[PDB]
RNA sequence: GUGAACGGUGGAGCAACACCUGAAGGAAGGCUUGAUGAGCGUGUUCCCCGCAUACGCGGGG
């Protein structure tokens, strides 16, 4: 990986640098993401609202849309 | 398939016009380039100082 974030193509959001590293289970929350309607209420928190969303793949395909429960950035 | 992928902040524009740094102000008042040094006396063994180490050298009044 170069680059992350939009717009790659005019040179923005060049990565520096990235660390990988483990962490405990309680510790990290992966459910900060846009999850289906259906999703188990443990991993829906206060910042999850119902949308229409992408919940996989490429995230611009408006044909992919569907019902979500995603955070907001 | 990084809600991505694609996308020029561009084109034009006088800092410039006018405007006297200088009007007035004493380098003055005293002062031998001539002085100084360049010529006129003593008539014979006597005190101190060093090198030596006394056989004598050096100096000194």
Avoid: M, N
Avoid at 15 to 40: M, Y
């Amino acid at each position: 990986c170069r680059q992350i974030g939009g717009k790659r193509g005019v040179g923005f959001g060049q990565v520096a640098g990235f660390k990988v590293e483990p962490v405990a289970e309680t510790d990290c929350p992966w459910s900060w993401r846009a999850l289906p309607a259906d999703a188990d209420p443990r991993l829906v928190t206060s910042e999850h609202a119902r949308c229409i969303a992408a919940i996989r793949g490429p995230y611009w395909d408006r044909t992919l849309h569907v019902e979500a429960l995603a955070p907001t950035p």
